[PDB]
Structure 1
């Protein structure tokens, strides 16, 4: 079985990672994990290559490689994702607002992400999360929208419906000349 598992895993690695040095690092940290069985260190080391949304399926690809006794902890330490979309209905005329912050848009080359949550607020109460990507506002696709257009679209009606996909990463660009990078929720929240 281990030549079949290796074959299927290798196909997933080649598809999601272009660079050979990044592949070599990936296989090396997995080799180290097999020796030490330190799952926390593994997930921490994996983050160096799993550094953008398109690379997150690697966590799914790696999970079968993880022995049964560590799969619960592995799931806890990795972002919880699902291809099923979550829909919520929010009231803009609420005295305390929506209770969330939002960053991103087409001009940044990234989607729209919830970056802050007010604990006990309206967004929080409906189960929205820091790291959620907004994929739909009032029924509309926002893949071709700038930041301002999305904000204006949210403010069109007295109420707003948001469809959400949990990613667990936040886009970062501290100046107009900086490249777009990604931070895991825990880092972004701690540094804010």
Structure 2
């Protein structure tokens, strides 16, 4: 069974980001977030790069990939 969001994720990131280097930055954060398992560091870096309010919507696709319980905490950490 696929995830579905995966497809939309690629399209979203590409549309919002549109950059090659930027895309690698996000992919790197996730790749490390898996082994590191640190939501604190993830949100931090994601902010420095996705700080642009225009990129905020990107967080939507980020949740799906992120663990369930992690999603809840993701919102608890990410302010507004």
Q: TM-score range by the shorter chain?
A: 0.7 to 0.9
Q: Deviations over 1:130-152 (max 9, x none)?
A: xxxxxxxxxxxxxxxxxxxxxxx
Question: Helix, strand or coil for the counterpart of 1:3?
Answer: coil
Shift, 1:4, TM fit? 3.7
Report how many aligned residue pairs link the two structures.
78
TM-score normalised per structure 1: 0.38
Say which structure is richer in strand. Answer: 1
**Which residue of the partner structure matches residue 35 of structure 1?**
35
Greater Rg by CA: 1
Once structures 1 and 2 are overlaid, which stretch shifts more, 66-75 or 21-30? 66-75
**CA root-mean-square deviation:** 1.6
In the aligned structure 1, how far is the partner of 2:60 from the partner of 2:8?
12
Shift, 1:7, TM fit? 2.0
Q: Deviations over 1:72-104 (max 9, x none)?
A: 2100112xxxxxxxxxxxxxxxxxxxxxxxxxx
Shift, 1:64, TM fit? 0.9
The unaligned stretches of length 5 or more in structure 2 are none
Q: Is the 8 A contact 2:17 2:55 kept in 1?
A: yes
The unaligned stretches of length 5 or more in structure 1 are 79-192
Shift, 1:24, TM fit? 0.5
In the aligned structure 2, how far is the partner of 1:2 from the partner of 1:8?
12
Shift, 1:57, TM fit? 0.3
Question: Helix, strand or coil for the counterpart of 2:28?
Answer: helix
Say which structure is richer in helix. Answer: 2
Shift, 1:50, TM fit? 0.6
Change (3 A) 1:44 1:2: farther
Asked whether 1:2 is paired with 2:2, we answer: yes
TM-score normalised per structure 2: 0.84
Shift, 1:58, TM fit? 1.0
After superposing on structure 2, the runs of 4+ consecutive aligned residues of structure 1 that deviate more than 6 Å are none
In the aligned structure 2, how far is the partner of 1:72 from the partner of 1:19?
29
In the aligned structure 1, how far is the partner of 2:8 from the partner of 2:51?
22
Asked whether 1:26 is paired with 2:26, we answer: yes
In the aligned structure 2, how far is the partner of 1:69 from the partner of 1:55?
23
